[PDB]
Write a protein that binds this DNA or RNA. Structure first.
Lengths: 128, 205, 155, 121, 80, 80
RNA sequence: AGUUGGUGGGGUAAAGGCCUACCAAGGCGACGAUCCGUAACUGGUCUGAGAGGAUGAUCAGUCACACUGGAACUGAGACAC
RNA sequence: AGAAUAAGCACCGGCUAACUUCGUGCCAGCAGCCGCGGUAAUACGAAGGGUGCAAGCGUUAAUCGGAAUUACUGGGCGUAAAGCGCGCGUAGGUGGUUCAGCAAGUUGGAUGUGAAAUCCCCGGGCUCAACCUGGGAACUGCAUCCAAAACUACUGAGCUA
């Protein structure tokens, strides 16, 4: 309703508790772009956009040993409290093993790349 | 100040060979090291976790004759200095002038070394330093004052230092009765019977 | 070669027709001291029997914690029944900064340099469960790369 | 809890009132004894504790415990009072420092002499 | 008047002086506009006895600053 | 060159002066949430044009009344 | 209700209701005005892993005061320990 | 010149390192909490012993911590304290999706400032230390300018969830 992005993570998180294979939900620039980071990071197998006037976003999910690959996904920059960090202040999820997706001005992209690119932005969510 | 008193009780309380006595005789022939001092030396009873750390703390304190206020500052400086707080600790009080002289063997015990150093009888780098707690550096030469060269105490202790374990990190010239501090020893160079990790954990309480 | 530590000994009781009966409950933690750890409980009428029953029960329920080496890998938080525990890796030198209830667990499990804190209830039985759950869910970097299907380049 | 609810009204910290209000942020005060008496403790205890009512230099009237065995205090005696209450004595929240001004230290004391103002023999 | 004087900034029986640019009305160790150098009368080993920062010393001198009888001697000694 | 502020005007029932509301957003020091703030300033208007509801711009300028140190730049938007 | 603006004049080293004459009814306030109690402020200090909490000795910057109230004089500078 | 002029304080039931005896017997008393003492007290008084500290040792008074016990970091509201009796609604807070613009937020850099001392890092001088001091770091802030347009704010144009 008032946070379509957090709807994406919770839809993903609920499915992995229920051992579902694919999920469907309306798409957007942020939803598709965050799916880009997740797929290139290996947390999701693949994502497609059903290009119609009302587009969906479909994610097929990954399980390694039955346990879902994404152990935990947590929203950070909620609409009630938008969170902005500098390059030095960007979070490190689980000591660098995880990824904290940060929407910088060079597109949506991970915290590891943001430090390399030397740009901060809005810390959207943390993954592990 | 300094602790003045019977020395076996310090070793008997812990049950470890504290080097408060010269190596002329083994401690068992001098004192009942198998009992803690006092009337109730024959009892039993497991020490608590905190007690083990505190007993570990006083072993390092009693071996070198240091009060905790300096030790706490020595801990603070060890906590200050980069690297592990563990080995930063023992180096700080191993570089004391009295302890270095004891390693040089000019005194049979650190108590002799402290009195001998405090009596202006030791000059390091040519200048008389009469304080036990001076921190010597790498390459510093520590010598005995020329008027004190004929002291039988250093004359006796130098031989007693032979049958005590030749320490590698410092060398002594017998004829000149002067030695140089090469470098600060590492963990392997000191006795492993200590547990310096008990030092850090106790001071976090 | 198994190092064993006693966390607590507790005197519980139950009432019957006439007086009360006393039972001693002890919880201990066992481990190799490098990579293995295990905890167990045991109830017996007497302390020498009580601490012993905990011994086999602990050694029969052990796991494999994947430490980074002399320390833990990543700061993690674990909870079990109103007992929240936070543990963070620490550099070489600092001792075991943890509560006496869990200090046995990290020290026995081979951890020697860690920063830990207990939040919420501090029941020794429950906090041991909490740290155990955190240590069991521990993941080494090569395992996470396997989940995401990449190399250690993800760091 | 809501971050917006906190912005309007920040979290408030209670300030506990001192358990020694008549001392007024001072380590000790000087007073005179208006009444020396003995009182009975609560349920578990049973004794005759010596307590005296003190008129402090700031006007406060309080009762403070007299520690030790035996005391020489009576009406119109200048004493120094320190903090710390007595759990089994209702209404007593101060202690009388032995060995200062009129209240002499306990006679024949050998252990813990400094706490009770006792000379070394 | 702006003046260049010495601010006693050492310890008991062990004086240390800061060569200080300040208004003459301010106290000796008090307010100033700029410190330019220092002087060590009891320097023993590696302690520099007198550092002047000759650049800024000329600028305030060109602005009308009047050095005291000690700084003027030290200023010449630095250049001599 | 010169810092000019923009705001919504609120009152114009005076002579040759108009009151402009300035919108600010300062984060709470602890909770880090942006809270909208108000800064009503008594702007001077040598001739009167601005009516209520118009966005205008003002410069910190000469104090020319007891509460009037800001004067108008121009109307950027007129409340038709 | 000089209260908030405007106009003329006076006044200051200088703008300004700083003062005055006249005109208008304005100005501030739940974004806390006004009132009550307390209090010199800051760099800083203590504690804390940090975020924070407590505090404003020594030293340094600013301010206010000089037995209480008020007033001006001289002077570049004071309404002056 | 001569060991000659130089050791005391608190505690020992658990928390908390350190125990026996004697006298007392819910009296005397201790006590930060649990609590001890009513005739065989490691908890009272004394002795011995030990413990910790040491020209200092304890008590008080006060702040912070422990206290995640005002929880932003970092708490809760079925029964432990906590969902207004229930609607509507003002200020406010937050707002589906697409394109373009702008640049207040946001990000990076530069400049000025953020007094000195202090905190911190590397050195130097007092026989060492306390202390002094050199340089650096920091002052997490503000102001201006320059770049960027993923997200928020604004503007313009749309779409139907």
């Amino acid at each position: 309703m008032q946070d379509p992005l957090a709807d994406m993570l919770t839809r993903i998180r609920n499915a992995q508790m229920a051992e579902k294979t694919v999920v469907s939900m309306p798409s957007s620039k942020l939803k598709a772009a965050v799916a880009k980071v997740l797929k290139d990071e290996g947390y999701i197998a693949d994502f497609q956009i059903s290009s119609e006037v009302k587009p969906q976003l479909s994610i097929e999910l990954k399980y390694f040993e039955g346990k879902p690959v994404i152990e935990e996904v947590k929203r950070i920059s909620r609409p009630g409290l938008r969170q902005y960090k500098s390059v030095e202040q960007l979070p490190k999820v689980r000591g660098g093993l995880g990824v904290s997706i940060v929407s910088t001005n060079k597109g949506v992209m991970t915290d590891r790349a943001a430090r390399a690119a030397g740009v901060g932005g809005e810390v959207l969510c943390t993954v592990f | 100040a300094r602790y003045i008193g019977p020395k076996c009780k310090l070793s008997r309380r812990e049950g470890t060979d504290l080097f408060l006595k010269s190596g002329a005789r083994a401690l068992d022939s001098k004192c009942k090291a198998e009992n803690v001092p006092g009337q109730h030396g024959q009892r039993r009873g497991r020490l608590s976790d905190y007690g083990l750390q505190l007993r570990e703390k006083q072993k390092v304190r009693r071996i070198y004759g240091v009060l905790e206020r300096q030790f706490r500052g020595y801990y603070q400086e060890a906590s200050r200095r980069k690297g592990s707080t563990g080995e930063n600790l023992l180096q700080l009080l191993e570089c004391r002038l009295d302890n270095v002289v004891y390693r040089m063997g000019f005194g049979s015990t650190r108590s002799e070394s402290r009195q001998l150093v405090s009596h202006k009888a030791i000059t390091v780098n040519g200048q008389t330093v009469n304080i036990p707690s001076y921190q010597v550096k790498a390459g510093d030469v520590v010598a005995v004052r020329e008027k004190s060269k004929n002291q039988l105490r250093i004359a006796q202790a130098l031989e007693l230092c032979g049958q005590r374990g030749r320490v590698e990190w410092v060398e002594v010239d017998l004829d000149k009765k002067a030695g140089t501090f090469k470098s600060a020893p590492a963990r392997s160079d000191l006795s492993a019977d200590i547990n310096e990790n008990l030092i850090v954990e106790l001071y976090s309480k | 070669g198994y190092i064993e530590k006693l966390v607590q000994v507790n005197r519980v009781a139950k009432t019957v027709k006439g007086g009360r009966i006393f039972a001693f409950t002890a919880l201990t933690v066992v481990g190799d001291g490098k990579g293995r750890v295990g905890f167990g409980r045991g109830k017996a009428r007497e302390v020498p029997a009580a601490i012993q029953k905990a011994m086999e029960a602990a050694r029969r329920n052990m796991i494999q914690v994947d430490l980074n080496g002399t320390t833990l890998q990543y700061p993690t938080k674990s909870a079990h029944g109103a007992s929240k525990v936070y543990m963070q890796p620490a550099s070489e030198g600092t001792g075991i900064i943890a509560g006496g209830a869990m200090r046995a667990v990290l020290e026995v499990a081979g951890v020697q340099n860690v920063l830990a804190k207990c939040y919420g209830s501090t029941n020794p039985v429950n906090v041991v469960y909490a740290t155990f759950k955190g240590l069991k869910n521990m993941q080494a970097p090569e395992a996470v790369a396997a989940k995401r299907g990449k190399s250690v380049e993800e760091i | 809890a809501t971050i917006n609810q906190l912005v309007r009204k920040p979290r408030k910290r209670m300030v506990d009132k001192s358990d020694v209000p008549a001392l007024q942020n001072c380590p000790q005060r000087r007073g005179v004894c208006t009444r020396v008496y003995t009182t009975t403790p609560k349920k578990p205890n049973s004794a005759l504790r010596k307590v005296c009512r003190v008129r402090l230099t700031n006007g406060f009237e309080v009762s403070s415990y007299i520690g030790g065995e035996g005391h020489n205090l009576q009406e119109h005696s200048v004493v120094l009072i320190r903090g710390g209450r007595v759990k089994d004595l209702p209404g007593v929240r101060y202690h009388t420092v032995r060995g200062s001004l009129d209240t002499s230290g306990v006679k024949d004391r050998k252990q813990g002499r400094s706490k009770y103002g006792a000379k070394r023999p | 008047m702006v003046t260049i004087r010495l601010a006693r900034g050492g310890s008991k029986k062990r004086p240390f002086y800061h060569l200080t640019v300040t208004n003459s009305r301010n106290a000796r160790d008090g307010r100033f506009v700029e410190r330019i150098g220092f002087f060590n009368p009891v320097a023993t080993g590696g302690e520099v006895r007198l550092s002047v920062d000759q650049e800024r010393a000329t600028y305030w001198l060109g602005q009308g600053a009047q050095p005291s009888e000690r700084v003027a001697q030290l200023l010449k000694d630095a250049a001599k | 060159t010169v810092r000019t502020l923009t705001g919504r005007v609120v009152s114009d029932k005076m002579d040759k002066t108009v009151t402009v509301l300035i919108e600010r957003r300062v984060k709470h020091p602890i909770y880090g949430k942006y809270v909208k703030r108000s800064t009503k300033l008594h702007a001077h208007d040598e001739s009167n044009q601005c009516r209520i509801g118009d966005l205008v711009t003002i410069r910190e300028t000469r104090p020319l009344a007891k509460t009037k140190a800001w004067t108008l730049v121009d109307i950027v938007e007129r409340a038709v």
